[PDB]
Amino acid sequence: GEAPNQALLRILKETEFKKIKVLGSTVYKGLWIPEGEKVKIPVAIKELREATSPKANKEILDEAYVMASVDNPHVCRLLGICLTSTVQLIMQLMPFGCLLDYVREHKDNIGSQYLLNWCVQIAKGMNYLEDRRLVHRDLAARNVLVKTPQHVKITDFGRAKLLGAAAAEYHAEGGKVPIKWMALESILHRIYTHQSDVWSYGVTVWELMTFGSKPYDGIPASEISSILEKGERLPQPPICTIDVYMIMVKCWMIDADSRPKFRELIIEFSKMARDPQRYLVIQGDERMHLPMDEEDMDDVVDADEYLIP
Numbered sequence: 001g002e003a004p005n006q007a008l009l010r011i012l013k014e015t016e017f018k019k020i021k022v023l024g025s026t027v028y029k030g031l032w033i034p035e036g037e038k039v040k041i042p043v044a045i046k047e048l049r050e051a052t053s054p055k056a057n058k059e060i061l062d063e064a065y066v067m068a069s070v071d072n073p074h075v076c077r078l079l080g081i082c083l084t085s086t087v088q089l090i091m092q093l094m095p096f097g098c099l100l101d102y103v104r105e106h107k108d109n110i111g112s113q114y115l116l117n118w119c120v121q122i123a124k125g126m127n128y129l130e131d132r133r134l135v136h137r138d139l140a141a142r143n144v145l146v147k148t149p150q151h152v153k154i155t156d157f158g159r160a161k162l163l164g165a166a167a168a169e170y171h172a173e174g175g176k177v178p179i180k181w182m183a184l185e186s187i188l189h190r191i192y193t194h195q196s197d198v199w200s201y202g203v204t205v206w207e208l209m210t211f212g213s214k215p216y217d218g219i220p221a222s223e224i225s226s227i228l229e230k231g232e233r234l235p236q237p238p239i240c241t242i243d244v245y246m247i248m249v250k251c252w253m254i255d256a257d258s259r260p261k262f263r264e265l266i267i268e269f270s271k272m273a274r275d276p277q278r279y280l281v282i283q284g285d286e287r288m289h290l291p292m293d294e295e296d297m298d299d300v301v302d303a304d305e306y307l308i309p
Ligand SMILES: */[SH]=c1/[nH]nc(-c2cccc(Br)c2)[nH]1
Pocket: 027, 044, 046, 075, 076, 077, 091, 092, 093, 094, 145, 153, 155, 156, 157
């Protein structure tokens, strides 16, 4: 019916971590020293907030299932889980944070080469999730992390659903949903496909090309479906040639099958990335430049160079 999932879930002991500092609020940053391996791995630890909630633990372990089952350079991977009172996911440290905050903070230093390269990397991540019959359902600039300015990865598998062997669409049943990133068929009929992820990819690319503007800003979510039905779409960003904007608009077609495939978005953004100043017009583009303190950094290895059978 479907291939067995032989991914390994690694259970890590509390004695393998040296939690250096705290990131957010319960988000933490630290080092993972696998039991006698002479390696230190920078990690982000997501430890449980409420901690009292059986519902919270079901959801955290669903995320861990998906993150443990993915292996791609443009997708965040789970190093393992810590089975203490609060169930923690241990993940690779992405030291520059979310791409949304990164484009807001560094507008003045982001050239066309970075922007179009990010678009290719996200399309590659999303194409890999499709090969794995996985629908993300929450693609947004906030859910892409920056390992380096040259290297981003898709994250937040909180809404991710594995399509059934014979189930092309997933049918959801209510909650707090990200309306402004969602395909029309998802807002109306709670239908979700690879093609509805493409719609979200479009909105994500618009966030990047506007240096992190809020889509349909100051419009309440209740009217978004009506606006889209009338045929309104997000406006052409100033830096965007019609070439780039036409690709975004195709991601926002009402016929889901008329939207591009992730594999096509890889091709189209790659061609544009070979001649970036022809596709994005940014003031001062040719000038733009983009790039921790623990006692001993000698045995530090990035998770991406730390592989296990
Ligand atoms: S690749 C990766 N590293 N950190 C994270 C992460 C941080 C905070 C929230 C989530 Br869902 C993931 N993933």
